[PDB]
Amino acid sequence: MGSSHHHHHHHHENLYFQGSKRKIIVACGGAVATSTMAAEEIKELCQSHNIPVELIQCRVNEIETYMDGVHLICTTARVDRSFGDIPLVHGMPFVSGVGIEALQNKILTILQG
């Protein structure tokens, strides 16, 4: 009927959306409200302006290993950011839970260019 083709059962395939555009990493630890705050915050923001991206989380020593296709890195003061051009940043004020509002504006300003 066409030399093996067209599946009636089901085309259970796996899409590769591990790119989109940019990929960021978050390094802190486990879950102490701080992590859930950033993830949710960065997610809501990324979607607020419809910015397709993939947010990944990692420990203090994982971003380097998973640094295959990361466009931005977020470490809580640990890395040196002096190797190559790893676009990482420290959310010191973001963790404060008070300086996020003001900082957020700054992040978006540069994020848009």
Is 54 a domain residue?
yes
Residues 6 or more apart in contact with residue 12 via CB below 8 angstroms: none
Contact 34, 91 (CB under 8 A): no
Of 86, 20, 18, 26, which is closest to residue 53 (Cα–Cα)?
20
Sign of CA dihedral 30, 111, 40, 15: negative
Residue 89 lies in a domain: yes
CATH code of 107's domain: 3.40.50.2300
The secondary structure of the chain in percent helix, strand, coil, rounded to multiples of 5, reads 30, 15, 55
Domain count, the chain: 1
DSSP letter at 33?
Answer: S
DSSP E strand boundaries for the chain: 22-27, 53-58, 72-75, 88-89
- The one catalytic residue in 28, 46, 58, 74 is 28
Experimental method: NMR
Residue 28 among the catalytic residues? yes
Identify the domain containing residue 79 by its residue range. 21-113
Q: 60, 75 in Cβ contact below 8 A?
A: yes
